[PDB]
Enzyme design. Structure first.
Site, PDB file in Angstrom:
ATOM      1  N   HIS A 161       0.822  -1.209   0.000  1.00  0.00           N
ATOM      2  CA  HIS A 161       0.000   0.000   0.000  1.00  0.00           C
ATOM      3  C   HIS A 161       0.863   1.269   0.000  1.00  0.00           C
ATOM      4  CE1 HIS A 161      -2.964   3.015   0.981  1.00  0.00           C
ATOM      5  NE2 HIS A 161      -3.942   2.129   1.060  1.00  0.00           N
ATOM      6  N   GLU A 194       1.457   3.712  -3.699  1.00  0.00           N
ATOM      7  CA  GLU A 194       1.061   5.125  -3.682  1.00  0.00           C
ATOM      8  C   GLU A 194       2.224   6.064  -4.026  1.00  0.00           C
ATOM      9  OE1 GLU A 194      -2.238   7.904  -2.649  1.00  0.00           O
ATOM     10  OE2 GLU A 194      -2.211   5.700  -2.481  1.00  0.00           O
ATOM     11  N   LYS A 254       2.917   5.452  -7.663  1.00  0.00           N
ATOM     12  CA  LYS A 254       1.805   6.070  -8.358  1.00  0.00           C
ATOM     13  C   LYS A 254       1.999   7.574  -8.457  1.00  0.00           C
ATOM     14  CE  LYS A 254      -1.375   7.817  -6.315  1.00  0.00           C
ATOM     15  NZ  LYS A 254      -1.059   8.989  -7.195  1.00  0.00           N
ATOM     16  N   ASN A 255       2.599   8.175  -7.434  1.00  0.00           N
ATOM     17  CA  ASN A 255       2.916   9.600  -7.475  1.00  0.00           C
ATOM     18  C   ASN A 255       4.171   9.874  -8.296  1.00  0.00           C
ATOM     19  OD1 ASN A 255       0.765  10.003  -5.741  1.00  0.00           O
ATOM     20  ND2 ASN A 255       2.059  10.275  -3.910  1.00  0.00           N
TER      21      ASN A 255
HETATM   22  C1  LIG Z   1      -2.354  14.172  -7.292  1.00  0.00           C
HETATM   23  O1  LIG Z   1      -1.422  14.038  -6.183  1.00  0.00           O
HETATM   24  C2  LIG Z   1      -0.126  14.473  -6.543  1.00  0.00           C
HETATM   25  C3  LIG Z   1       0.327  15.816  -6.202  1.00  0.00           C
HETATM   26  C4  LIG Z   1       1.658  16.243  -6.575  1.00  0.00           C
HETATM   27  C5  LIG Z   1       2.570  15.341  -7.301  1.00  0.00           C
HETATM   28  C6  LIG Z   1       4.023  15.790  -7.694  1.00  0.00           C
HETATM   29  C7  LIG Z   1       5.266  15.180  -7.159  1.00  0.00           C
HETATM   30  C8  LIG Z   1       5.402  14.005  -6.140  1.00  0.00           C
HETATM   31  C9  LIG Z   1       4.598  13.918  -4.919  1.00  0.00           C
HETATM   32  C10 LIG Z   1       4.727  12.825  -4.010  1.00  0.00           C
HETATM   33  C11 LIG Z   1       5.664  11.778  -4.284  1.00  0.00           C
HETATM   34  O2  LIG Z   1       5.780  10.733  -3.420  1.00  0.00           O
HETATM   35  C12 LIG Z   1       6.481  11.823  -5.471  1.00  0.00           C
HETATM   36  C13 LIG Z   1       6.358  12.920  -6.397  1.00  0.00           C
HETATM   37  O3  LIG Z   1       7.141  12.910  -7.493  1.00  0.00           O
HETATM   38  N1  LIG Z   1       6.344  15.849  -7.752  1.00  0.00           N
HETATM   39  N2  LIG Z   1       5.872  16.827  -8.612  1.00  0.00           N
HETATM   40  C14 LIG Z   1       4.469  16.818  -8.600  1.00  0.00           C
HETATM   41  C15 LIG Z   1       3.679  17.807  -9.472  1.00  0.00           C
HETATM   42  C16 LIG Z   1       2.083  14.008  -7.623  1.00  0.00           C
HETATM   43  C17 LIG Z   1       0.769  13.574  -7.258  1.00  0.00           C
END
Ligand SMILES: COc1ccc(-c2c(-c3ccc(O)cc3O)n[nH]c2C)cc1
Ligand SMILES: COc1ccc(-c2c(-c3ccc(O)cc3O)n[nH]c2C)cc1
Lengths: 337, 344
Positions: B228, B232, B235-236
């Site tokens: 989990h 995530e 996924k980000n």
């Molecule tokens: C829709 O939710 C979101 C909100 C912001 C992001 C995001 C991240 C990021 C944020 C967290 C992470 O663990 C790794 C990343 O590269 N980096 N740059 C952006 C524009 C991605 C998803």
């Protein structure tokens, strides 16, 4: 408790930005204005922190060392309050003030180690106090230096700078110097020192030099402290092999942020002990360097991988206008802490 | 709210360690002990989080919490009965299992509902200090659910004949292959990623056993929790990457490094999705999938952190305890302290 310190504590410190500080030195031939500000602000900040010293534990305030600190601050507060009667138009006042400021910068020069002994003689509220006490001194040292280096006859600091602020600070240059500074300390002790692999990225306009308004020495302090740590850790952990692993630094400028990440392969430290590196109870380095990063709304964090190595990131503000002093205030919100 | 929730509120949660967990089902630790410990514990945890719920602002305590309270009070009361029963009544154990299967399915709609109320909170317009309190309350509420679900699964998977993987003790893998969990969690993100995007990042994975050098990485842990968190973060990492490099020839790999140490299992996933500014980071953690993830990491004394480079990429790092005895439950307790909720 002297009547002046109880009085001037009853005010809240006024934070300034590096944009404003910058301005005390430009078209501004008016130290007339710096004199009226500082003869008010310096007493208030000193008075605020003197008041927060009275809450320190009984055994602590009555240390030789704290009592010496108390008396210097109380002395400089007194000395500054005496300029309250003169007018900012009095050329004789403007100049005595420079000398008295130089006098106070001097008197306070032993303050930070004295304070240490003061604690090394006597938990979590210490830390809270030491962070505030030291931020307080960082901020007053900076205001006095700023005034001293812009107006005094015979201390003109770096000519690129307005006071000690470089309005066009070459961040990577400071990184090379601080590294090349640490690199040669390490050679006093080891047959070898790690190399520097460095990369920059300019968010705003790419492939253009990275410059921001900052105070070059504060940055230098942070970076040197973190480069020294990296090197020592890379050399201890790899006392086997021939060449060391390099230290990797990336400098990044963005919309709001100036970020610097320092990576080493020095073996790392367990999560559990990280919290202690930032504790006053070696130093005073990592803790202080963090106060420096935070002093203008930035920060400094450690993210280690126990068994491999460590990342250090510094955050600075990219715009003068959001580089604003972070100042403790002695009020009730602080009382309950 | 019956003379029940208040009684068991008097008590504070008793955190288990994965070692204890591992033993509460090891060498056939008769369901009697687990029955005995859970028929006490679960009510105390429910009793505990229920008192928290009665501090929430006037209106919130809503189409949502209104119902969460009922389920918990029923569940708590349901679990009460087995106090009047003895551990030796097999008919009772066999009912404890099902009664644990019902409460679950009753609670599987907890998480949905609670974020409904989040309808609305206090007044239908909510300020920072009130809102911070919601963040506060919610970390605790979900941690609490995570903890109660954890203990219930364990009992069921090891005593009900819903049996999970035979090699596992309940939901816990005493020989979790961390690196394999990273690869699947990566892959599950790559697919979902590619059901929606034209192309997806690669996995450039590196591996270092500090504890015992040449050896693969295994620690005691609950694979699904690990999955989990990692899903995530991947996924980000992919979406930030794909989005940020709309203009780039190809995509840069997402880099992860797994390191096991004397005390710590550390996982660092890093990307070049242009990052987010220091001022925004927290929003990322404000109340859900990322907040919840952090709760999993912290559930057994670990942690989840982000440190980004606005304008370049982002570093996500997971901390887990490498020793089972140190992997102790992090539970909220309702009390004088928790109830009691400078610089310029
Ligand atoms: C829709 O939710 C979101 C909100 C912001 C992001 C995001 C991240 C990021 C944020 C967290 C992470 O663990 C790794 C990343 O590269 N980096 N740059 C952006 C524009 C991605 C998803
Ligand atoms: C202050 O005394 C110390 C305490 C601990 C260390 C240290 C670091 C480290 C610590 C901080 C850092 O920024 C980078 C690093 O590689 N990694 N490994 C060790 C043993 C070095 C100096």
């Amino acid at each position: 408790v002297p009547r002046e310190v109880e009085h001037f504590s009853r005010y809240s410190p006024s934070p300034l930005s590096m944009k404003q500080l910058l301005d005390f030195g430009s078209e501004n031939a008016c130290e007339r204005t710096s004199f009226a500000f500082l003869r008010q602000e310096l007493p208030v900040r000193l008075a605020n922190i003197l008041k927060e010293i009275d809450i320190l534990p009984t055994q602590l305030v009555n240390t030789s060392s704290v009592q010496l600190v108390k008396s210097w601050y109380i002395q400089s507060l007194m000395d500054l309050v005496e300029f309250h009667e003169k007018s900012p138009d009095d050329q004789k006042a403007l100049s005595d003030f420079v000398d008295t400021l130089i006098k106070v910068r001097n008197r306070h020069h032993n303050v930070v180690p004295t304070m240490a002994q003061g604690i090394i003689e006597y938990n979590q509220n210490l830390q809270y106090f030491l962070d505030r006490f030291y931020m307080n001194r960082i901020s007053t040292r900076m205001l006095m230096n700023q005034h001293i280096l812009i107006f005094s006859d015979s201390q003109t600091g770096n000519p690129s700078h307005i006071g000690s602020i470089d309005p066009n600070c070459d961040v990577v240059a400071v990184v090379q110097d601080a590294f090349e500074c640490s690199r040669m300390l390490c050679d006093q002790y080891y047959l070898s020192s790690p190399e520097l692999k460095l990369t920059q990225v300019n968010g705003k306009f790419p492939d253009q030099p990275i410059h921001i308004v900052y105070v070059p020495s504060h940055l230098h302090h942070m970076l040197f402290e973190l480069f020294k740590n990296a090197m020592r850790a890379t050399v201890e952990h790899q006392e086997n092999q021939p060449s060391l692993t390099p230290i990797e630094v990336i400098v990044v400028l963005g919309k709001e942020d100036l970020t610097i990440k320092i990576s080493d392969r020095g073996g790392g430290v367990p999560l559990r002990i990280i919290d202690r590196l930032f504790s006053y109870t070696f130093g005073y380095g990592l803790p202080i360097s963090r106060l420096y990063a935070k002093y203008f709304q930035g920060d400094l964090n450690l993210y280690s991988l126990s068994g491999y190595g460590t990342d250090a990131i510094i955050y600075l503000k990219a715009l003068s206008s959001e580089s604003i002093e972070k100042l403790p205030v002695f009020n009730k919100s602080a009382f309950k802490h």
